[PDB]
Amino acid sequence: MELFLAGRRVLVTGAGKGIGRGTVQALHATGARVVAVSRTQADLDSLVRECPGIEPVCVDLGDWEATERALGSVGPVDLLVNNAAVALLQPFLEVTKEAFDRSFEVNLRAVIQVSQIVARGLIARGVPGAIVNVSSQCSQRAVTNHSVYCSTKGALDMLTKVMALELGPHKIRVNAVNPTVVMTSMGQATWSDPHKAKTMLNRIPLGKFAEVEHVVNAILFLLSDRSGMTTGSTLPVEGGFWAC
Amino acid sequence: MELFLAGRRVLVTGAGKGIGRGTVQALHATGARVVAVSRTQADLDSLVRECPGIEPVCVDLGDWEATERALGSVGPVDLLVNNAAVALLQPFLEVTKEAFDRSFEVNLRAVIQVSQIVARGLIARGVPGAIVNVSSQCSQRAVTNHSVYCSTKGALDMLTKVMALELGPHKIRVNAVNPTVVMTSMGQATWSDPHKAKTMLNRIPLGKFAEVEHVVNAILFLLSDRSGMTTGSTLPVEGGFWAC
Numbered sequence: 089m090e091l092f093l094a095g096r097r098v099l100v101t102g103a104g105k106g107i108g109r110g111t112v113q114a115l116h117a118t119g120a121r122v123v124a125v126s127r128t129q130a131d132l133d134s135l136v137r138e139c140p141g142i143e144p145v146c147v148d149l150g151d152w153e154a155t156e157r158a159l160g161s162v163g164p165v166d167l168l169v170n171n172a173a174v175a176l177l178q179p180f181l182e183v184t185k186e187a188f189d190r191s192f193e194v195n196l197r198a199v200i201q202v203s204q205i206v207a208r209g210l211i212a213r214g215v216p217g218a219i220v221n222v223s224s225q226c227s228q229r230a231v232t233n234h235s236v237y238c239s240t241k242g243a244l245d246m247l248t249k250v251m252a253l254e255l256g257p258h259k260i261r262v263n264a265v266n267p268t269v270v271m272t273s274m275g276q277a278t279w280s281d282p283h284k285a286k287t288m289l290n291r292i293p294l295g296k297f298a299e300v301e302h303v304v305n306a307i308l309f310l311l312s313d314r315s316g317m318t319t320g321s322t323l324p325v326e327g328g329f330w331a332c
Numbered sequence: 333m334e335l336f337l338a339g340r341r342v343l344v345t346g347a348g349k350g351i352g353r354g355t356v357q358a359l360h361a362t363g364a365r366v367v368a369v370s371r372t373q374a375d376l377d378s379l380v381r382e383c384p385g386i387e388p389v390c391v392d393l394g395d396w397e398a399t400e401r402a403l404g405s406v407g408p409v410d411l412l413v414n415n416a417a418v419a420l421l422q423p424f425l426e427v428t429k430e431a432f433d434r435s436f437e438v439n440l441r442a443v444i445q446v447s448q449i450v451a452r453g454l455i456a457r458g459v460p461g462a463i464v465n466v467s468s469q470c471s472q473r474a475v476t477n478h479s480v481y482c483s484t485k486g487a488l489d490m491l492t493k494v495m496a497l498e499l500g501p502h503k504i505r506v507n508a509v510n511p512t513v514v515m516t517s518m519g520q521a522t523w524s525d526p527h528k529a530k531t532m533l534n535r536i537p538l539g540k541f542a543e544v545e546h547v548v549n550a551i552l553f554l555l556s557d558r559s560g561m562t563t564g565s566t567l568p569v570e571g572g573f574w575a576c
C-alpha cells in the first residue's frame with residue numbers, strides 16, 4: 089500500500105533511542121528525508137553512521153529558548169512525529185514540583201512548540217501535512233506511580249484534538265498513537281520484573297507487549313495520505329488492553 | 333438534600349428482585365407512588381405486603397404485545413426506572429439465536445417501549461420528567477462469556493444518549509447508571525466462586541463490590557431535580573473499575 093513518504097521531509101523528536109530511532113530507520117529506508125532531533129549527541133552520531141543523509145539536531149526539548157534557536161532554522165518540514173518524552177515515576181503522595189515541571193515541559197510544552205514551528209511553515213507554503221503525537225495506553229487508564237506521566241499523556245490526547253480542530257482548515261492532520269509497554273529502555277526500566285509485567289500481560293488479549301515495529305507501522309499509516317479522513321484520533325497499539 | 337420525590341408517580345421495571353426491589357422500597361419510604369412491574373407474581377405479592385400501596389403489574393417485558401396491553405392503561409407516570417434485564421452468558425462461539433433474541437427483547441426493546449409510553453404521557457400533560465436506565469460496568473469493558481449481555485448494555489448507553497437528545501426539548505432527562513458486580517441473584521450466580529470475585533476485586537480501587545443501596549442512591553439522585561443539567565450520561569457505580 090503506497091503511502092507517499094518517499095521524498096518528503098520528516099522531523100522526528102526523541103530519535104536517539106527506542107521507538108523514535110526505529111521510526112527514523114523505517115523512514116530512511118522508504119526514501120523520506122529525515123531530521124532527527126534528540127538530547128544525546130552520541131545517539132545521533134551512531135544514527136548518522138547507520139542512516140547516511142539524515143540531519144541530526146541535538147537539543148534538550150525541555151528548554152523553550154534553546155529549542156527555538158535550534159529548530160527555527162530547520163526549514164521546510166512536511167511531516168512531524170512528536171515522540172520525545174520522559175517517564176518520572178513517583179507515588180502520588182511523593183510527587184515533587186521538579187518532576188511535575190520537567191515532565192510537562194518535555195512531554196507536552198515541547199509538543200506545542202515544535203508543532204507550531206512545523207505548522208507555521210506548512211501554512212506559509214500552502215501545502216497539506218500531518219503530525220503524529222506518541223501518547224500511551226495510560227493516557228486513558230491509570231497506573232500506580234504514574235500520576236504525572238499519565239496526566240501528560242491524558243493532556244496530550246486532548247491537545248491532539250484541539251490541534252486537529254484548529255489545524256484542520258489548513259489541511260494538516262493530527263493524530264496520536266497509544267502503545268502498551270514496549271521493551272525499549274523506558275519499558276525495561278519498569279516492566280522487566282516478571283511479576284509486575286505479568287499483571288499487565290494478563291490484561292492484554294493478544295497476550296504480549298508491543299514491538300517497536302508495531303508502533304512504527306501505526307505511525308507511518310497515520311502520516312500517510314492513506315488515512316486522509318482520520319484526525320483528532322487516538323490509535324491504540326495495546327494488544328486490546330483498552331477493551332477489557 | 334431534598335430531592336422532592338414525594339407525591340410523584342414512579343414506574344420501576346424488574347421490581348420483583350434485587351436493585352429494582354430495593355429501588356421500590358426506597359421510593360415507597362419517601363412517599364412516592366410506585367408502579368412495580370415484574371415477571372413473577374409471587375415477587376409482587378410479597379412486595380405489596382412489605383410496601384402497601386404500590387401498584388403491581390405482572391407481565392413479561394420481552395413480549396411487546398402483552399406489555400402494551402398491560403401498560404397502555406397505567407396512568408400518569410412522572411418518573412421511570414428501566415431496570416429489568418436478563419443475563420444469558422455464553423462463550424462467543426456458542427452464542428445462540430435464541431439467547432440473542434431474548435436478551436435484546438428484554439434488555440433493550442422493552443426499554444424503548446416502556447419509555448415511549450411514559451414520554452408520550454408526560455408530553456401530553458406538558459410536564460417535565462426523568463428516566464433512568466440501569467446499565468452496567470460491562471457496557472464499556474468486555475468480560476468473557478458476556479458478548480451478548482455487554483452488547484445489550486453498550487446499546488443501552490447509546491440509546492440513553494439519543495433519548496436524551498430527542499427528549500431534551502420536552503424537559504425530560506434520560507441518564508444511565510453503571511454498577512459493578514452487586515450481590516443480587518444476578519451477581520451471586522456468576523461471581524460466587526472466590527477465585528471469580530478475586531479477579532475483578534483486584535481491579536476495583538475501593539476493593540469491594542457494590543451494594544444495592546449504592547445503586548439506589550445514584551438512581552434517586554439522577555431522578556431528582558438535583559441533577560437538572562445532567563442528561564445523556566453514564567454514572568459509574570463501580571468503585572473505580574473504569575479508571576484503570
Ligand SMILES: NC(=O)c1ccc[n+]([C@@H]2O[C@H](COP(=O)([O-])OP(=O)(O)OC[C@H]3O[C@@H](n4cnc5c(N)ncnc54)[C@H](OP(=O)(O)O)[C@@H]3O)[C@@H](O)[C@H]2O)c1
Pocket residue numbers: 101102103104105106107108125126127128131147148149150170171172173174194222223224225266267268269270271272273274275276
Ligand atoms: N516504551 C514504552 O513502554 C512506551 C509505552 C507507551 C508509550 N511510550 C511512548 O513512546 C515514546 C518513546 O518512548 P521510548 O520507549 O522510545 O523511550 P526511550 O527509549 O527512553 O527513548 C526516548 C527518546 O526521547 C529522547 N528525549 C527525551 N527527552 C528529551 C528531551 N528533553 N529533549 C530531546 N530528546 C529527548 C531520549 O533521549 P535521551 O535518552 O538522550 O534522553 C530518547 O532518545 C514516548 O513518548 C513514550 O512516552 C513508550
Ligand SMILES: NC(=O)c1ccc[n+]([C@@H]2O[C@H](COP(=O)([O-])OP(=O)(O)OC[C@H]3O[C@@H](n4cnc5c(N)ncnc54)[C@H](OP(=O)(O)O)[C@@H]3O)[C@@H](O)[C@H]2O)c1
Pocket residue numbers: 345346347348349350351352369370371372375391392393394414415416417418438466467468469510511512513514515516517518519
Ligand atoms: N447484579 C449485578 O451484578 C448487576 C451488575 C451490573 C448491572 N446490573 C443491572 O441491574 C439491573 C437489575 O439487576 P439485578 O442484579 O437486580 O437482577 P435480579 O436480582 O435478577 O432482578 C432482575 C429483576 O428483573 C425482572 N425481570 C427480568 N426479566 C424480566 C422480564 N422479561 N419482564 C419483567 N420483568 C423481568 C426479574 O424478574 P424474574 O426474576 O421474575 O424473572 C427480576 O425481578 C439490570 O439491568 C442488571 O443488568 C446488575
Ligand SMILES: O=P([O-])(O)O
Pocket residue numbers: 224225226227231234267268269
Ligand atoms: O501505562 P504505561 O506505563 O504502560 O505506558
Ligand SMILES: O=P([O-])(O)O
Pocket residue numbers: 468469470471475478511512513
Ligand atoms: O455486568 P458486569 O460487568 O458486572 O459483568
Ligand SMILES: [K+]
Pocket residue numbers: 175224269
Ligand atoms: K509507559
Ligand SMILES: [K+]
Pocket residue numbers: 419468470513
Ligand atoms: K453483570
